[PDB]
Structures are given as C-alpha cells and as structure tokens.
Amino acid sequence: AGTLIGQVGVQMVIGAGCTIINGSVSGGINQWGTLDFGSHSDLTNVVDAQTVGTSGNIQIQCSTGLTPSLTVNAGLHASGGQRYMQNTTTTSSTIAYNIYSDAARSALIQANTPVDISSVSTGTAVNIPLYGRVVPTGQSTPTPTAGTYTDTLLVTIAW
Amino acid sequence: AGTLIGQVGVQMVIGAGCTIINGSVSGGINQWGTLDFGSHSDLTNVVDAQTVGTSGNIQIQCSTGLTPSLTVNAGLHASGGQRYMQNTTTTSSTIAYNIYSDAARSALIQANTPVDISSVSTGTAVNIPLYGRVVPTGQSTPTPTAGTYTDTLLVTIAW
Amino acid sequence: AGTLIGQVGVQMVIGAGCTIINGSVSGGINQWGTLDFGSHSDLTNVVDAQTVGTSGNIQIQCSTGLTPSLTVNAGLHASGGQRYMQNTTTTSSTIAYNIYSDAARSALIQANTPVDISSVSTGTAVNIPLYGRVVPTGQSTPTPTAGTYTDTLLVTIAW
Amino acid sequence: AGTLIGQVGVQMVIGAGCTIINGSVSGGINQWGTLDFGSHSDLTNVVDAQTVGTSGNIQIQCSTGLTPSLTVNAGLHASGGQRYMQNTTTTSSTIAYNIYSDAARSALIQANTPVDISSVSTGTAVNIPLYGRVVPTGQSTPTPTAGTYTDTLLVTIAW
Amino acid sequence: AGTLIGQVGVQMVIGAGCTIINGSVSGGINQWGTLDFGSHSDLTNVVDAQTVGTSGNIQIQCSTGLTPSLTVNAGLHASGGQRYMQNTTTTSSTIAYNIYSDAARSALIQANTPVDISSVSTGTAVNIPLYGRVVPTGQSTPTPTAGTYTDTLLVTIAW
C-alpha cells in the first residue's frame, strides 16, 4: 500500500584517537579491567586500589588537545548516591566504597557527573584516572561476614 | 501507419501514513541522515552509533496497524555479505561493520532480507530501527591508515 | 431533388505491429492500467510509481524499426502546464505531480509534446515508458486533507 | 410495319447544391476517398479511422435547408448484417468492423437504412459523417494472419 | 380544263403491338416523359438519371419477335456530335451530356444511328432503354452559372 526509498550513508573517520588500551572485549561488552581491592578481614584500616586488568594496568594514551569528559555510572547496588558492594551468598552484607579521579584521592567522582580530565592529553600513555578507596567509617558493622563481594560500573569517555 | 488511443488514469490516496520524518530531500534522492560513528584511531574497542541527521534524530512515526517491512541493501563496497568502508584516498584500507534492527544490537540485518519491524506502530514517533556497531575482530590489521572512510546504503520501507 | 452515388472502400493491413499489451477494453475506451502511487500522509518525501494494470505491468512489445512517438495529454485538472490531482470530496485540496519518459526520471514529458521513444523497438516486450514522481516542493501546504485523489490522462502512440 | 414519333426533353437545374468535394472520378465510378485504418498486428485495442482521400479530407459543403439522407450499402463480404474485411491472399481470414454517423461513434449506421444527417447544412464545408471503428470483440480469433484486407461500400446521398 | 378521278384507300391493322405506355399526348406531339437530372451546383461528380414521366416510369411493353430499332435525334443545341444543354436566361452557359441504351451506361447512342434493342421483346413491360449521364470532364468551366438548363430530343421507334 506504500513504499519509500532513501539512502542513509555511513561515515567513519580515522585520526584523532584517545582510545583505551589493555582492555579486552568479549562480545561487545568492552571490559576495562577490574578494581581489585584484595583480601582483608574485619576492615578497620583504609584500603587503596587501582584499576588493573590482566597483564598490564589500564592506560589512556589520549590525543593532543581534545579535552575529554569522564562519566562513571552508579553501581548496580546503590543507595543514597554511594556505591555499594553486595555478597554473592548473603544479600544483607554490604561494604561501602568511594572512587576518585586522581592519585591523591582528593577529588571525588559523583554519579552521572562528567569530570574534565584534560591532563591525560599529549599521549604518553598515562594511567587511567580511576582510583578507589575503602574507609572504615559508616561501614555498617565494622566486621562483616565472609564472601566475595562484587560490583560493576559503567565508565563513559566523551570528547 | 498506425495510431492507438487510450487513457491511463492516476490515483493517489491520503490516509494511513507511516512516513519518515526529519529527512531532507535534495533532488529526489530522499536522504535520511547519516550513520556517524565518530573519530577514532587504532580501533580496538567496540564503537556504537545511531542514524542521526542534521538537527534531530531520524524517527518513524508510523500508522496504526500496517505491519511494515524494512529492507537494507548491501553497501557499494561489499564482499562476502559483509558491508565495508573504503577510504577516499587509499583504496586498500578497509573497515568492516555490522548493522542491527534493535537498540540492544542483538538482531542482525542481512542484505536484501526484509525485517518485520511491527513494533514501530501506534505513532509516538519512535526512533528508526537502524543501529550500527564496529567490532575489532577480523578488521584486517588492527590499526588502519588515516582518512575519512565512507559508505552509502539503500533503505526501503514497504508496507 | 438530387442523388449522388459513390463507393468509399475500406482497407486494413496486418503486419508491422507495435501494439500495447495487458490493457483491458470496456466500451472502446481502451484503458491502459493505472498510475497507483499508493497510500501516504503528510507527504514530505519523494514517491515513485509506475503504470501497473490488473495482473501484469503494461508493456509495449513494439515492432522492428518504426520509430514511434508518445504524446501525453494534460490532466483534467491542470493549471500552468503542471498536472494536478483533485479530491473527490473537497475541491480545494490538490497535489501536484510530474511524469517522465525514462526509469531514471530525468527526461520530463511536456503536455501535447511528442516524445521520440525509439528504444522500445526490436520487440522484447519492454515496459512502457511512463513513470510518475511526486516531489514535496511547491505542493501547496505540506500536509493535505484526507481523501482519494484521482486524475486521468490521454496517452497517444503515433508511428 | 410501324413507326412512332415522340420527344423526350432533358432538363437540368443549377442552384441548391450539397455536392461532395475532394472526390476524384475515374470512369463515372465517382470514388470518395478511402477508410484507411492503418497497420496493426494482433488486434486487441480499438482502432479508429475516418474517410480520407488523396490530398484532403472528404467534406460535404451542403446547401442551406434541404434535409438530406445518407444510405450506406453493406459490403461485398457481409454476413449477418455486419460488414467484413477479407484478405486478398487467404479467403478464410476475416476482420469485422462497424461504421458510425458521428464523431463520437455513438450512432450506428445500419445496412440499407437512411440516416437523417441534417446538421451538415449551412455550408461551412463540414467533414462527411462517416467514421469507422474496429473493436477486438467477436473478431474470430484475436490474432489474424498477414495480408492486406480490403472492402468497398456504396454511399448514396439523397435529398 | 381537266379532271382526274381516283380512289386512294386507307388501311390500318390491329395486331402486333410494341407501343409505348405512360406517355401523354397534348396536340399530336406525343410526349414521352422527361430526363430529369435533378438539382446540383458546381458539378464535379457524375450524375445519373432515367426517363421518368408524370406518375410512372416510361416502359416499352413490346410484342413478341419484331426486332425494333431505336433512333435518337441530336438536340436542338448541338455541336460536334455531342448534345448540349443551354440556359433559358444566359446563352453562353452550357453543360454537355451523354445518353446510353443500357442500364450499365456502357453502350453509347450516336446521333441519327439506329440501335437494335431486340431484348425488350416478349412483353413484360420492360423499362425504355434510354439512360443519361453527365460526366464532369470537358464541361467547359467546372462551375457554371445559375439557371434551368433545358433540351429536347426526338425519339423514333421503327420496327
């Protein structure tokens, strides 16, 4: 009863880069390592960790200029704007954690808020600005149960 | 030595619609936007893009009922049933890409094969079901040369 | 008061043909199909159609040699040399349309102007050179009212 | 053995005319043109023709008043009151045809039946009311053989 | 101075007939109808007429056997052996005409030359063998003036 004809056209340009390195892809998921905090018990001291994946650390290796933006989604298990970790065995146990955009862990990254990380330019393959820290305050009870707590984020680089 | 007389008669009906919106026409070509993947270098991560044209995204705004059919022709530079992109400067460089009929990019669109996209009905001006993805597997060498790769399709809506 | 006697004589020759096929005749009208554009609403994209009648497409199947001439009369509802379509319900609504003598729709057919379509010779039953196109420019208001717009032509083949 | 004497007396009057024009005479036959239908093959569409002879069309140019009568004899090859055409090579092949007294071809002329064509008066040299049409119904088989079919009539004008 | 005496004797026999019918007599003139050609203007087509008088056509109704002879005198206005017609108003205008002894108008009747019309025998009241035809060749100028052209013959039947 009708018919419309049109052409779309597809264009892609190779040039200015700023693409992540040392990140494996399985099925288009585009995984970018893991924030491995390590093994501890009865957390009463601050623990620091950085995004490490398989062989080598995740790096940026951005292009000259091109001030980018980093956006980190809240975790699957979130409440009150603070990302959480939930055990795979017991649903009640939970550990809170924070994430920072600098090595000194002074600038906090908020959920769904872009961060102007413009210092990763000029190549040089600098480490990705994503550092986590667990502080033993407000961590429900100081001593949690046993398990393997896990959580996943969603990191977006726009430029 | 001869003469034949006859009348043809031309009929057009306005009513049930299901016509594309936000698509400019120049000379009867009836262009429908562009699949702009963006700028990258040394493609090693999956890149997603959607059909965007000038001011606003391409939409359908189909009519009630009228289960339509979407057919996408293979590109000008094709081999083995997979659409390709070819540089305007160097003929050797090529990047493969795929196209999907859903946002999740789970249903693949084959060349010259109709797709029963019946969920775009009831108006509401839903986005056109045409999404592309570039996966860094089988992309000849992982790092291509520089240029502005281009390709054009031929989208047909029958209903 | 007077009387004159004379003989006229009637002659018809069967031989060189070049006669239309797939065209029904009712009462000597000698109908030759219909230019069915289809169903649309708020025409903003170019629509193409070809002369189709009942079971099969209208064809020529002309004879060897015999360079013919195609003449298309202006429609019943015409103004300024451009053929129009008028609704059967509301007299004000009108859609303009054009007609072409080739598949590419590059050569326009003017009213009461013969066209030397000499490429339809050597039999082979080629499709009749009559293609229509509706372009959404100068179409009064872009969105018309509802109805079943109709128009009739008068196609003459002389050779 | 006998002898009778008498005078006959011959009278002719010049005045009111209504005499045919553009008609050559050879030996008193008083020919009045030809109904040339043209060249066709596999007649499936209606063909129209008018009485044309040598340089110009046959005309009447009748006198004021003087309501005349037109009588057309049946052809040499006739059967069932319908005039026929017979090939000069094969006797079996035959095409039927009709004749009309008006341009619209709505009033049929019957064999040996006068027609009151009173509208050809007031001079003005109007075209002779004799039009033929071949309709592809009841034409034996739709496709005839090759040849030059011919037939002759006998037109009488009485007034 | 003298005187002679003698008897003549008058004899008439009734029997074998072959006498004309449908012919009025006024004063011994013994008129036999009229060759009424009719009314025409600008004679360019052959005109035929037969000897008709008052109520009915002139007939012979001859007797059995008795091969008769028909002799037709030249007209009052004759020149070169061809009978002519002269207007009663203008003496210059003239139309030539011929006369024939058969219906087909193939056998010409010459002035003062007997014709052996032996086929009118056996009664049956056959039409008189006298037919006239006007041919538009050598008729001075093709278009004559107005008037009522007349001429009289002298028909003799000897047997």
Numbering used by the authors:
A (entry chain E), B (entry chain D), C (entry chain A), D (entry chain B), E (entry chain C): 24 to 182
Give me lines lifted from the publication on this model.
Chaperone-Usher Pathway (CUP) pili are among the most widely distributed and best-characterized adhesins in Gram-negative bacteria. In the assembled pilus, each pilin subunit provides its N-terminal β-strand to the following subunit to complete its Ig-like fold in a process termed donor-strand complementation. The best-characterized archaic CUP pili include the CupE system in P. aeruginosa and the Csu system in Acinetobacter baumannii. Archaic CUP pili are crucial for the formation of biofilms, which play an important role in persistent and chronic infections.
After deducing the symmetry of the pilus from two-dimensional class averages of single filaments, we performed helical reconstruction and obtained a 3.5 Å-resolution cryo-EM density, from which an atomic model of the CupE pilus could be built. The atomic model reveals an arrangement of CupE1 subunits in a zigzag architecture (215° right-handed rotation per subunit). In agreement with classical CUP proteins, the N-terminal β1-strand of each (n+1)th subunit completes the Ig-like fold of the nth subunit. This donor strand interacts with the nth subunit through both β-sheet hydrogen bonding as well as hydrophobic interactions, filling a hydrophobic groove in the subunit core. The structure also shows two key cysteine residues (C41-C85) forming a disulfide bridge within a β-sheet from which the donor strand extends. The 13-residue donor strand of the (n+1)th subunit represents the majority of the interaction with the nth subunit. The interface between the Ig-like domains is relatively small in comparison to the extensive donor-strand interactions, and is mainly maintained by the interaction of a loop with the next subunit, with two interacting valine residues V69 and V48 at the core of the interaction. Thus, the CupE pilus shows a relaxed arrangement of subunits compared to the tight packing of the Csu pilus, resulting in a higher rise per subunit than in the Csu pilus. Visual inspection of the CupE pilus along the helical axis showed a serine and threonine-rich loop (TTTTSST) extending outward from the helical axis of the CupE pilus, constituting the part of the subunit that is most exposed to the environment. In the EM map, we noticed extra density near the loop that could not be attributed to the atomic model of the CupE1 protein subunit and that we suspected might correspond to a post-translational modification.
